[PDB]
Ligand binder design. Sequence first.
Ligand code: GG3
Ligand code: GG3
Ligand code: MG
Lengths: 308, 297
Amino acid sequence: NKMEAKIDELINNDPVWSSQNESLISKPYNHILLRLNLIVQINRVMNLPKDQLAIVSQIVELLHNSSLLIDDIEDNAPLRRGQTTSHLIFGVPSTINTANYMYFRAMQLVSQLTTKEPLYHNLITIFNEELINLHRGQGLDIYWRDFLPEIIPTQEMYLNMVMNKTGGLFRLTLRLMEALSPSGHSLVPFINLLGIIYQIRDDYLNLKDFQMGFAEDITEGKLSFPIVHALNFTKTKGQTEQHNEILRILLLRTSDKDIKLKLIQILEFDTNSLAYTKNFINQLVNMIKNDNENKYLPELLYIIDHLS
Amino acid sequence: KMEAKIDELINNDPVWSSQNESLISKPYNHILLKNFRLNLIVQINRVMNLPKDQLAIVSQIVELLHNSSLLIDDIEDNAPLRRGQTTSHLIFGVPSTINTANYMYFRAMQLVSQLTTKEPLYHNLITIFNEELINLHRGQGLDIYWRDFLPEIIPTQEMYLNMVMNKTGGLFRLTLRLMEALSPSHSLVPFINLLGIIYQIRDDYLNLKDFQMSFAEDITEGKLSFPIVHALNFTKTKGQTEQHNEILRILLLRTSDKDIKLKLIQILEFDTNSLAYTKNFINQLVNMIKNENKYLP
Ligand SMILES: CN(CCCCc1ccccc1)CCC(O)(P(=O)(O)O)P(=O)(O)O
Ligand SMILES: CN(CCCCc1ccccc1)CCC(O)(P(=O)(O)O)P(=O)(O)O
Ligand SMILES: [Mg+2]
């Protein structure tokens, strides 16, 4: 009877949750807490009041960090910015849960951007759309890597994957801002380009810093821009043994330095994928540095050079 | 030319094909392999009277969340089996399974926007969805924390019940709250909360019972199960130090050894009588429902 009473009190009330509980489950996220400038540069064109901008920034910070927590689990990464990955400290289970929890806390923050219902609807849809896009590209990248050689993506396929996986957070941020603006043409194209440059450079530097960075993308088996070029080049030029050796090294998930270095030199001297990628980056970067009529642009370059 | 193809890319929406859609959907399609879930929604609709059309979408949203949460739950519990079939993450890998499951959360979210076009109502439906996914994760988070930090914290029965209100109460309340918000006709939330609690305790109980008369994967997982919480607090209170530690030691083993699993169940059967205490607890919760329609409609 005292039990029924306690049960009645329980089910007629919201779930009990303490600040203590909140702290216990935020451990994986607080650890990774250990680009505001980008939001700021973009606002020079968007003109949102500082308090609304602070919230946009918080939503993006939460999505970005939660994405990395998941990303490192999916990539089996032992390090993130020189420090141990959260999943290795607190475990995969709590890290997945906490990262997913933060996606929804970010969602909750959108309502703090406006009281006006029409705008609200648009903001949520934007948030919903780019999160869908992010998971689509992430899914492809992961599928290509874990089922290799089932699918050898072409350069076109890679770029489409990146438009989703990486362009997703860039467009989310930008689109939220454009929708909130109380103030020319949309900068989505420019942000899409920024995202592509960001990803190819990220892929590039992962190997170049090693050759000149632990080339962890090799250990991971990732279909990076240089690898995608090498695999299509070898197939095309009939370099049968080199093509297969590239596949073989990716499939070893090796941390051996010499093996990673052998692969990088294949990309350097045999397929010339490194120079190809470097030039590719330069081309995309000149496309912005060169549109004097501001076909893409509205201190935007400083950013482009620190994109890393 | 290269400039041109890039120009064509960045000015279009990201490319995504039907074939891409299928690849990402594999881990999910695998768990689809629902009749009692549909039945619960149907039965409740006799009071909400949503127009079939709209009932189907709620049903679709619930199916997505329920299934994606199980894909994630099996990874978090390192479960090898789900309803007798091999778990998704063991076939498609942890990486694709996490991603596909999370993708389905956002697909479910998209379906919410298609329940209504009325602006006020839409906002409430989103807030409902948002709030219960928050609760689900909090609850799941605490359940996982207790298990993975054991023996730092041993919960009491009350802590366990509050955890369940979140972990299991969320999907139940999410379905009910949406339906009540959509109804064109007292809340049934308190009733759905009890359904969820009865649901979780019976799930914990059967996991040990089915095996006692035979996987008891909960032991292998080291779960702070309802019978386990009772046995741990019982031995502490009765000052039975060595029995208390023995339960702790078996759970910490993460053991698949049948004999050791059986040893823990006999502690629960003969020392703390925890399985019988649980049977009784569930029967009392149910009696609350069968015995003036305060909870019932
Ligand atoms: C999809 N994510 C966005 C990363 C962050 C992109 C970004 C967005 C907004 C602001 C700054 C950076 C990419 C993460 C990686 O690039 P990937 O796993 O694809 O190689 P990395 O593991 O190398 O860090
Ligand atoms: C969260 N899950 C489902 C909760 C109830 C799911 C449900 C089913 C149908 C309709 C609504 C909700 C609780 C049960 C578990 O997942 P399972 O024992 O199946 O591994 P766990 O105890 O491990 O957390
Ligand atoms: Mg990564």
